[PDB]
Amino acid sequence: NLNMDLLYMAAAVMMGLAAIGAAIGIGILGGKFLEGAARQPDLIPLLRTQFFIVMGLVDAIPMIAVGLGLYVMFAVA
Amino acid sequence: NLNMDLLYMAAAVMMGLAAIGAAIGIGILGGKFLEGAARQPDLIPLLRTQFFIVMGLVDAIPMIAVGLGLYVMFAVA
Amino acid sequence: NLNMDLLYMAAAVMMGLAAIGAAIGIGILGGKFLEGAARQPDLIPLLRTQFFIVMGLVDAIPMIAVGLGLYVMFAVA
Amino acid sequence: NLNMDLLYMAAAVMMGLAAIGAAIGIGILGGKFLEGAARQPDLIPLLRTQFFIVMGLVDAIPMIAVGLGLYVMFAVA
Amino acid sequence: NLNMDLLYMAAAVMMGLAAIGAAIGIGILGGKFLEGAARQPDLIPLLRTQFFIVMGLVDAIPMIAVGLGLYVMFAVA
Amino acid sequence: NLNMDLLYMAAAVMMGLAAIGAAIGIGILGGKFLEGAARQPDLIPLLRTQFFIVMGLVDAIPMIAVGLGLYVMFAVA
Amino acid sequence: TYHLDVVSAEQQMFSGLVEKIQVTGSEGELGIYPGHAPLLTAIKPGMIRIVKQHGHEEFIYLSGGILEVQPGNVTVLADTAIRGQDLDEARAMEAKRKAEE
Amino acid sequence: ENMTPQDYIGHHLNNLQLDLRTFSLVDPQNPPATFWTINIDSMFFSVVLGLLFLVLFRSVAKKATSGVPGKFQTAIELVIGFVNGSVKDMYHGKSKLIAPLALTIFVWVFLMNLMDLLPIDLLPYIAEHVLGLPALRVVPSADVNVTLSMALGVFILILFYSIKMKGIGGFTKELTLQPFNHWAFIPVNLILEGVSLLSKPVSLGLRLFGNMYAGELIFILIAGLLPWWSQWILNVPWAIFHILIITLQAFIFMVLTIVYLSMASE
Amino acid sequence: MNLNATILGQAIAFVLFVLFAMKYVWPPLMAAIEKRQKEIADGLASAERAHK
Amino acid sequence: MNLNATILGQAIAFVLFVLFAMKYVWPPLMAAIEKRQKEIADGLASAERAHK
């Protein structure tokens, strides 16, 4: 039956959106991090820790979406 | 055919839009947080607590979509 | 049957749009709040109150949109 | 079968667009209001009162959009 | 007669796009208006007149779109 | 026959979204890095190191997306 | 071209018409050209270097000060020292103890 | 063994529901459609955690002296100081209820979330084989009900504070007039205030449930899909993240409850 | 997922825990550290009064 | 699928996570040690100072 094709499309949309968000938000955050590290070059180890702290919060939902897309693509289809 | 794959596509829409919104909003918030921390490297706990307040407020509503998408995928479909 | 099945997609679209709008708006608002609290640390409880005041205004339309999507996906579907 | 279903679909897209617009506009307006509050905290009682008037103009149109969406969902069915 | 159902979707898309455009434009204008009122609080009644003059232009196309969508929704359908 | 044809669109959307996300995120990060290098030409070797540290996080998800798009285009076809 | 002044509270250090200058601004190195928009910034200690009319090179070391720009005028309000350490608070103590003793 | 990963995931997302009427163990293969079937697994682990919290806090409170502090007492004194400092930061009233409520919320929510770090199959395998229970899932927080019951209790407390400290007159006044204060907007004001008021606790409960549920399902997928030799390279980076996640989420629940109660009262 | 009457039993458990903790748990704690601070402060105050 | 292999892999991953937590999440007790040192030293020294 033809039903199998649509699962690939749904996984494609979900993972593409997840990658769009995971790239853009991390890019903005890293740009601010670099801007702040340029000013105070001695504070890099602290800003770098806080950057990781917030970056963990950023990508979580994209990670969920990517994992679900992998599941839909391989296990279901 | 029409039953399962449309549900999968709906879940994919939910959890792509939720990932987009949450990632972009958290990146925006974290940019201002990291900018503040470079200006006042001492006040970091207070600013990060306020950031936690706002981060919870942001994250609250996309998680509705995330959980409902998981429900639609597994319980319904 | 297709009639009820598509309702899930309609609710998915509605609540995904609601989530993206709310997440982005609240992220911008919280970023401005964080920057303000970083300029004037002694002022934080006032700005936080103002932020809650305006956040109660922001979320109302996304909140009702998500509630109506939940209605269409549970009571209707 | 698909008449009421498409009615719900049209209501869904309408209300999603309305929620997106309202959330983004109020986010921008509240962010600028927060910045103006931050600059001169003692002026907040006036700036808040002007922000309320402007936010009423912001809210004017998404509310007729949402009202027509509710009409489509409930009355037309 | 399937003719009726597509007209509701055609009205819905028009009104949603009009709501998005008008709400984001009015928020952008009002944000600068509020920041200017924050800077020079004595000039507020003049800036309000200027803001109304400009707002009369922002809503030119959006109000035509909303009127035409409302016309399509009731008179034509 | 649709099982073969639709897979190319499912890969096309993935490899468009991944490219848009990676391009926007890398553009914003590179712009911030360029501004920091312009202001502080002495720190260029340090800012470049931190830029390459951060950039490997942006590409994490879009490279999964592009690899899965290549897989969908070629292996399953 | 513009007329560059270099002055301090004690003395006029330099005055003359200048085609371009290199100066270390508060946030980074800065170059000034004729017709530059009005600008105000402190300057960190270091060399400010000058080309007078006909592009003659001149170098001046400054402990610090404030640089500002006006239509056709550039004025450097240099000061004697960084002053950021504030060691003279110790100098104020002996004035008190010797008054008490 | 022979199993489809889809069904392995299916079992784990099921609960030892038991009929309150007939006292009968529901099974994961066929769910009945009767409302009163308590989901036992989350509640059984949930009150156990509260009992452990109460036992430890009493076991330290029963002996603590102002002399040389012990190594064990120091953690409890630190958590008491942290909760008290947060309350004093965001609450100025005389109500003795707020601080112990926040302390209980923080500790209990932290304990519930911690269950997710454990191996997903350990306790369920034990319960199925040694005991014989049809189903089990051991993270209480992943239950929507535990989250929604706590959020609705907090909302009830908010209503009580609005009626008592803020006042019923001061509640009708705010609902009708604010934020636009004009009678033309009063019908709109009522709707906006009600929507935001109901949005707050729903946001708390569904945020917590979403976090715990989307961590538990990630662990279940990692266990079910990947071969044993490869599981660690994706499981370990996730538990480290989820430790910060559970700490942050318990902190968020406590602080947001404090904020809502303080805004209702004062 | 699926709502159930578990919503009620946990509402009983929550209120019971809240009542028991509010009564017994909190009041004994936080006394010792306050006693330490008061001892340090009053010893300082008394010593400075005798110094004056 | 074999269920034994899943239990083996989950055990492996939990062992590795326990090791990582013990060597990177446990140390905050070291931060907690400073509180003990401060409390003991300040209390004893301040009481002695007041009595003297």
Numbering used by the authors:
A (entry chain O), B (entry chain P), C (entry chain I), D (entry chain Q), E (entry chain L), F (entry chain N): 3 to 79
G (entry chain H): 3 to 103
H (entry chain a): 4 to 269
I (entry chain X), J (entry chain Y): 1 to 52
Can you list sentences taken from the study reporting this PDB entry?
A key component in the generation of cellular energy is the F1Fo ATP synthase, a biological rotary motor that converts proton motive force (pmf) to adenosine tri-phosphate (ATP) in both oxidative phosphorylation and photophosphorylation. The enzyme is based on two rotary motors, termed F1 and Fo, that are coupled together by two stalks: a central rotor stalk and a peripheral stator stalk. The central stalk is comprised of subunits ε and γ and rotates during the enzyme’s catalytic cycle. E. coli and other related bacteria exploit an internal subunit, termed ε, that can sense the environment and inhibit the enzyme under certain conditions.
Masked 3D classification focusing on the central rotor highlighted sub-states in which the εCTD adopted either a condensed down conformation or an extended half-up conformation. The maps generated for each of these sub-states showed the position of the εCTD, with local resolution estimates of 4–5 Å. However, due to the likely high flexibility of this sample, it was still difficult to unequivocally assign the position of the membrane domain subunits (a, b, and c subunits) in the maps. To obtain clearer information in this region, a refinement that focused on the Fo motor was performed and produced maps of sufficient detail to enable fitting of the membrane region. In the half up sub-states, no density for εCTH2 was observed, however εCTH1 remained attached to subunit γ. The sub-states of State 2 showed the best detail for the two εCTD conformations and allowed the c subunits to be assigned to Fo rotational sub-states based on their interaction with the εNTD, assuming that the c-ring remains bound during rotation, which is likely because the interface between the ring and central rotor has a buried surface of ~1200 Å230. In the present study we observe that the Fo motor rotates two c subunit steps in the clockwise direction (when viewed from the membrane, i.e. the synthesis direction) when the εCTD transitions from the half-up to the down conformation. Torsional flexing of the central stalk facilitates the majority of this Fo rotation, while the peripheral stalk flexes to accommodate the remainder. When the εCTD is in the up or half-up conformation, the εCTH1 binds to the γ subunit, clamping the central rotor together. This clamping would stabilize the central stalk in a closed position, increasing the stiffness of the rotor which, in turn, has the potential to impede enzyme turnover by decreasing the flexibility of the intact enzyme.
